[PDB]
Amino acid sequence: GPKFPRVKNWELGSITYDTLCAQSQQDGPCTPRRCLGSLVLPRKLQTRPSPGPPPAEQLLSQARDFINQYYSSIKRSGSQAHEERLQEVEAEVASTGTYHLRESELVFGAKQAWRNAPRCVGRIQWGKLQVFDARDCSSAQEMFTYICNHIKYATNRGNLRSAITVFPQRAPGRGDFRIWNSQLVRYAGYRQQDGSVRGDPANVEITELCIQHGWTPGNGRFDVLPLLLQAPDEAPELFVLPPELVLEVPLEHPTLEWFAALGLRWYALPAVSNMLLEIGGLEFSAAPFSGWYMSTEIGTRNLCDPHRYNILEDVAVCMDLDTRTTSSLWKDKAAVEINLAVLHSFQLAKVTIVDHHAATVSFMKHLDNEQKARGGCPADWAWIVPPISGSLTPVFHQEMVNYILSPAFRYQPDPW
Amino acid sequence: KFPRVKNWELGSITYDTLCAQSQQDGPCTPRRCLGSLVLPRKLQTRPSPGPPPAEQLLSQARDFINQYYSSIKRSGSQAHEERLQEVEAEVASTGTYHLRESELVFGAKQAWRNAPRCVGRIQWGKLQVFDARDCSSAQEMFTYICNHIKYATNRGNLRSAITVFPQRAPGRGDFRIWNSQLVRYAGYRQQDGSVRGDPANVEITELCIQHGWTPGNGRFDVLPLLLQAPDEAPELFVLPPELVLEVPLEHPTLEWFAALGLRWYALPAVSNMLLEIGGLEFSAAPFSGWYMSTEIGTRNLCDPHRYNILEDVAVCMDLDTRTTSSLWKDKAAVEINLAVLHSFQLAKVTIVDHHAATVSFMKHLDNEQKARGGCPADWAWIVPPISGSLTPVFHQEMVNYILSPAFRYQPDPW
Numbered sequence: 078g079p080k081f082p083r084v085k086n087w088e089l090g091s092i093t094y095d096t097l098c099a100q101s102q103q104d105g106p107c108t109p110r111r112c113l114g115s116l117v118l119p120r121k122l123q124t125r126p127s128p129g130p131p132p133a134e135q136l137l138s139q140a141r142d143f144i145n146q147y148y149s150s151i152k153r154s155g156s157q158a159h160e161e162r163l164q165e166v167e168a169e170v171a172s173t174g175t176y177h178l179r180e181s182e183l184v185f186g187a188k189q190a191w192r193n194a195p196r197c198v199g200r201i202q203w204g205k206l207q208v209f210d211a212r213d214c215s216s217a218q219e220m221f222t223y224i225c226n227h228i229k230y231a232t233n234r235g236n237l238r239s240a241i242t243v244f245p246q247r248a249p250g251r252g253d254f255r256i257w258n259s260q261l262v263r264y265a266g267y268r269q270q271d272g273s274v275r276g277d278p279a280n281v282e283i284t285e286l287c288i289q290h291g292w293t294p295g296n297g298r299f300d301v302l303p304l305l306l307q308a309p310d311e312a313p314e315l316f317v318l319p320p321e322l323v324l325e326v327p328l329e330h331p332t333l334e335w336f337a338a339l340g341l342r343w344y345a346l347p348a349v350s351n352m353l354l355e356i357g358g359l360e361f362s363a364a365p366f367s368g369w370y371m372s373t374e375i376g377t378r379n380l381c382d383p384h385r386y387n388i389l390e391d392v393a394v395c396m397d398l399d400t401r402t403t404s405s406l407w408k409d410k411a412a413v414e415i416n417l418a419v420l421h422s423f424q425l426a427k428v429t430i431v432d433h434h435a436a437t438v439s440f441m442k443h444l445d446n447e448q449k450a451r452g453g454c455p456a457d458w459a460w461i462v463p464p465i466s467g468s469l470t471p472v473f474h475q476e477m478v479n480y481i482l483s484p485a486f487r488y489q490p491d492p493w
Numbered sequence: 494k495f496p497r498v499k500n501w502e503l504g505s506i507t508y509d510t511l512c513a514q515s516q517q518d519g520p521c522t523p524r525r526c527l528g529s530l531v532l533p534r535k536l537q538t539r540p541s542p543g544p545p546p547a548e549q550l551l552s553q554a555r556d557f558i559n560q561y562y563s564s565i566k567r568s569g570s571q572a573h574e575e576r577l578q579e580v581e582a583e584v585a586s587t588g589t590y591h592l593r594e595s596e597l598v599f600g601a602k603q604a605w606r607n608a609p610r611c612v613g614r615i616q617w618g619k620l621q622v623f624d625a626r627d628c629s630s631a632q633e634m635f636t637y638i639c640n641h642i643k644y645a646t647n648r649g650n651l652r653s654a655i656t657v658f659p660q661r662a663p664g665r666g667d668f669r670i671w672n673s674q675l676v677r678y679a680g681y682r683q684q685d686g687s688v689r690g691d692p693a694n695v696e697i698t699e700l701c702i703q704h705g706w707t708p709g710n711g712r713f714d715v716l717p718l719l720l721q722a723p724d725e726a727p728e729l730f731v732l733p734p735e736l737v738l739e740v741p742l743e744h745p746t747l748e749w750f751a752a753l754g755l756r757w758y759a760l761p762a763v764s765n766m767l768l769e770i771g772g773l774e775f776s777a778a779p780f781s782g783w784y785m786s787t788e789i790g791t792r793n794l795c796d797p798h799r800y801n802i803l804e805d806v807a808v809c810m811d812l813d814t815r816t817t818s819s820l821w822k823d824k825a826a827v828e829i830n831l832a833v834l835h836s837f838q839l840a841k842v843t844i845v846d847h848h849a850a851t852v853s854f855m856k857h858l859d860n861e862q863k864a865r866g867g868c869p870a871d872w873a874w875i876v877p878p879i880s881g882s883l884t885p886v887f888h889q890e891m892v893n894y895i896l897s898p899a900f901r902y903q904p905d906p907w
C-alpha cells in the first residue's frame with residue numbers, strides 16, 4: 078500500500094500513515110542496523126558551539142524553507158509578498174551572513190517548535206502560546222526583568238498560561254545569551270560531608286556553580302536557586318528571585334493526615350530554560366518556555382526517582398507497608414498515594430495541573446487533529462507514556478513515529 | 494559506530510559493540526524511528542514454497558556452526574571442520590541441511606538470549622529443549638504438546654521449555670500451531686457485538702467452532718488446539734483439564750474480590766512464533782517459561798480491549814470513578830496486580846512480580862555486557878505496563894538490533 082510508515086492503535090484497531098515524516102530534514106540516531114530510540118541525548122541534534130559563521134549556502138536553504146512554511150501557514154505561498162520576503166532574506170544573508178525574523182514570523186516559529194516537540198504531551202495547547210519578544214534585551218540585568226515579567230504572567234496567580242520569552246539570537250564571533258539554570262525555578266542540591274545530598278540531587282552542579290559565583294547558600298531541602306544570566310561576552314551575573322513571584326504549593330494527602338507533616342512541597346511553574354530554539358537557521362540560545370505541570374512529573378519523577386527526592390520508602394513506612402519484599406507492591410502503592418497528593422494539593426491551591434489520564438487523552442485528540450492538518454505527528458513513545466500506569470492510559474496502545482521537524486527545541490551544551 | 498549507553502539512575506555508561514554482529518535490518522532509518530511499532534511491515538517471514546539461495550543459506554549456516562563450536566571451546570578443531578563440510582555437502586545436494594540435536598539445543602537457548610522483548614532472559618541458560626522433529630502427524634504434535642505442558646507445569650513449579658517440530662521445507666506446507674498460545678480463554682461474540690471471554694481470542698475461537706468445536710458460554714473457557722500438519726486442514730484437540738493448571742483469583746485483604754470469580758492459567762506458552770537457527774526455519778516451535786504478574790494483572794485483565802475489568806473493581810472498592818484525577822484506575826490496577834501475585838503465591842505456582850523481574854534483567858544486562866559487549870533490548874516492552882519509573886529498567890538506555898539465532902513473527906496460517 079502507501080509508502081510511508083503505517084501506524085496502528087492496538088486498542089481501537091485503527092490505522093494511519095505518517096506522511097509528515099517525509100518533510101523531516103535532519104537525520105536522527107537510528108539506522109537499519111540498530112535503534113537508539115530509548116537514548117535521552119543521542120549525539121545528533123546537539124547544536125555544538127559552532128564558532129565560524131554557518132555555511133551561507135546551508136543557512137540560506139534553512140531560511141528559505143522556514144519562510145515557505147510561514148507563508149503557507151498564512152495561505153499566501155507563491156505570492157509576491159512571499160517571493161519578496163524570500164529575496165529579502167537572501168539579500169541580507171549575502172551582505173551580513175545572517176538575517177532577522179519579523180515579529181509575526183517569530184510567533185509562528187515559536188509555536189511550530191512546540192508543535193513539533195516529540196517529547197511534549199501537552200501539544201494540544203500549541204496554538205495558544207504567549208510569545209514575548211525580547212530580541213532588544215542588551216544586559217544580563219535586562220534578562221532578569223523579562224524573566225520576572227514572564228514568571229508573573231505565566232503564573233497568573235495559580236491560573237497558569239503558556240509562554241516563552243525570546244532573547245537575542247547568535248551572532249558570528251559574538252558570545253551567546255545564556256541561562257545557566259535548567260529551569261527558571263529549581264531547588265538546590267547540597268553536597269554533604271557523608272557524600273549524600275540535601276534537597277534536589279539533580280541541581281547539584283548548578284548549585285555549586287551559583288556559590289562559586291557569589292550566592293550565599295541556604296540549607297533547606299527546598300530552597301529556590303538564584304539565576305545565572307549570561308549576556309554576550311560577559312561572565313554571568315547572579316540574580317535572586319523575589320519570593321512573591323515564585324508561587325509554591327505545600328503538599329498534603331486528601332485522607333492520610335500525616336502526609337502534610339512530611340513537609341513536602343513543589344513550585345507551580347515549570348520553565349525549561351536551557352534549550353535552544355532554532356527557527357529557519359537562526360539559533361536562539363536563551364528562550365525559556367513554560368506551561369503547566371502534569372502530576373506524574375512531580376509525584377513520580379521528581380519525588381520518587383532513586384536519584385531525586387527518593388521519598389518512596391519514607392512514605393511506605395508511614396502507610397505501614399511491607400518494604401522488605403517487592404511482591405507487596407509497596408512501591409506501587411505509595412507511588413499512587415504520592416501522586417494523588419500532588420493532584421489534590423494543586424487542586425486545593427487552585428494552581429493549574431493535569432493528570433496523566435486527562436493529559437494523555439488530550440494527546441490522542443492532538444494526534445487525530447495533526448493527522449488531518451499535517452498527515453502525522455512526531456512523538457517519542459518512551460517519553461509520551463507516563464512513568465506510572467502506562468497501559469492504563471491510551472497512548473501506551475498508540476504506535477508512534479519519531480522524527481525531527483524544524484522549528485524545534487534542541488538540547489545545547491552548558492555554557493561552562 | 495559503537496553506541497554509548499547510559500543509566501540515568503546510577504550515572505554508569507557502556508558501549509554496545511555487540512550490535513556490530515547484526516546481519517539483519519530493523520524498521521528504523523536516520524529519517525525516523527519506528528521502534529514503538531509492534532510488527533515489522535516487511536521483516537515478515539514470507540512463504541517457503543521455493544528453496545532459499547544456496548549461498549544465503551550456506552553463510553548463515555557457516556556462521557551458526559562457527560558460533561556453536563565457539564560455545565564448546567572446540568573451534569578450529571577437526572569435528573568443526575568435518576561439521577562444516579557435512580553442511581556444505583548437504584546444502585549443495587538437497588539445497589538444505591539439518592541440525593544435530595546438540596546444535597538445536599544451542600540454537601534455542603541463543604534465540605531466547607537474543608530476544609529483545611523478553612525480560613526473563615537471565616534464565617536463558619536453563620532451557621529444557623524437547624526435540625520433536627521426528628513428528629509426522631497432527632496427533633503426534635498433540636502428544637508432544639501434551640508432554641511439554643505436563644513437564645513445563647510440573648505441579649506449579651514451572652520450568653522453562655521449548656518443543657521444536659519439523660523445520661520448514663521447500664514446496665511443502667509448514668507444520669503450524671494455529672493458536673497464539675498453548676492455553677487461551679475463548680472469545681465469543683454475543684448479541685450487542687460485545688464479547689464474552691477474551692476479546693483477543695475472538696478470531697481463533699471462531700476458527701475452532703468452525704472446525705467442529707462445541708463452544709461454551711463462559712469467560713474463561715480453555716480453548717482447544719488446532720494443530721496443522723503440512724498441506725492438510727488442521728485438527729481439533731481438547732486439552733486434558735488436569736494438564737491445564739489454573740489459578741483462582743482472590744485478594745489478601747479485600748474479602749469480596751474472590752466474588753468476582755476471576756481465574757487465570759499458569760502456563761504462558763507462545764506458540765505462533767518462528768524459530769530461526771543458522772538459516773533453517775521452524776514454523777512450529779512452542780516455548781514457555783513463567784508469568785510476570787503484570788502480564789495478567791495489568792494487560793490481560795485491565796486492557797480496555799481485553800477483560801477490561803478496571804471499572805468493576807473500582808466500584809467494588811467504592812472509588813470516585815467520576816473524575817480521572819481521583820486515580821481510581823491506578824488504585825484498582827495495583828490491587829488487581831496484588832491479587833494476581835497473592836493468588837499464584839497461595840496456589841504455589843511460579844510467578845515473578847515486575848520489580849523482582851526487572852531487577853534480574855538489570856543483572857542480565859551486566860552479565861551480558863561482560864560476555865558479549867552488549868545486549869539487545871526493546872525498552873518499550875522491557876519496561877512494565879505500570880509503575881514504570883519505579884523499576885530500574887525505566888532509567889536504563891538500551892540498544893535494539895536483530896541477532897540470530899532468533900525468534901521472529903510469521904504470518905497466520907489462514
Ligand code: HEM
Pocket residue numbers: 187191194196197198199200202206239240241349352366367368369370371374431436486
Ligand atoms: C501547557 C501545558 C504543557 C504540558 C502539560 C506539557 C507537558 C510536557 C511533559 C510531561 C513533558 C515531559 C516532561 C519531562 O519528562 O521532563 C514535556 C516536554 C517538553 N515540552 Fe511540554 N508541556 C506543556 C507546555 C509546553 C510549552 C509551552 C512548550 C514550548 C513552547 C513545551 C515544549 C516541550 C519540549 C521542548 C519538551 C521536551 C524538553 C525535554 O526534552 O526535556 N511544553 N512537556
Ligand code: HEM
Pocket residue numbers: 601605608610611612613614616620653654655763780781782783784785788845850874900
Ligand atoms: C522464565 C520465565 C520467563 C519470563 C518471566 C519471561 C518474561 C517475558 C515477558 C514479560 C515478555 C513480554 C510478554 C508480552 O508482554 O507479550 C517476554 C517476551 C518474550 N519472551 Fe520471555 N519470559 C520467560 C521465558 C521465555 C522463554 C523460555 C523463551 C524462549 C525459549 C522466551 C522468549 C521470549 C520472546 C521471544 C519474547 C517476545 C514474544 C513476542 O514478541 O510476543 N521467554 N518474556
Ligand SMILES: C[C@H](O)[C@H](O)[C@H]1CNc2nc(N)[nH]c(=O)c2N1
Pocket residue numbers: 115116117459460461501887888889890891
Ligand atoms: C533511559 C530512558 O530513556 C529514560 O529514563 C527516559 C524514559 N522516558 C522518559 N519520559 C519522560 N517524559 N521523561 C523522562 O525523563 C524520561 N526518561
Ligand SMILES: C[C@H](O)[C@H](O)[C@H]1CNc2nc(N)[nH]c(=O)c2N1
Pocket residue numbers: 087473474475476477529530531873874875876
Ligand atoms: C504500541 C506499543 O508499541 C505497544 O502497546 C507495546 C508497548 N509495550 C509493550 N510491552 C510489553 N511487554 N508487551 C507488549 O505487548 C507491549 N506493547
Ligand SMILES: NC(=[NH2+])NCCC[C@H](N)C(=O)O
Pocket residue numbers: 347348349367368369370371374375378379
Ligand atoms: N509541564 C511542563 N511544562 N513540564 C516541563 C518539564 C518539567 C520537569 N519534568 C519537572 O518535573 O520540573
Ligand SMILES: NC(=[NH2+])NCCC[C@H](N)C(=O)O
Pocket residue numbers: 613674761762763781782783784785788789793
Ligand atoms: N512470561 C511469559 N512467558 N510470557 C509470554 C507472553 C505472555 C502474554 N503476555 C500473556 O500474558 O498471555
Ligand SMILES: [Zn+2]
Pocket residue numbers: 107111112113114521525526527528
Ligand atoms: Zn528507532
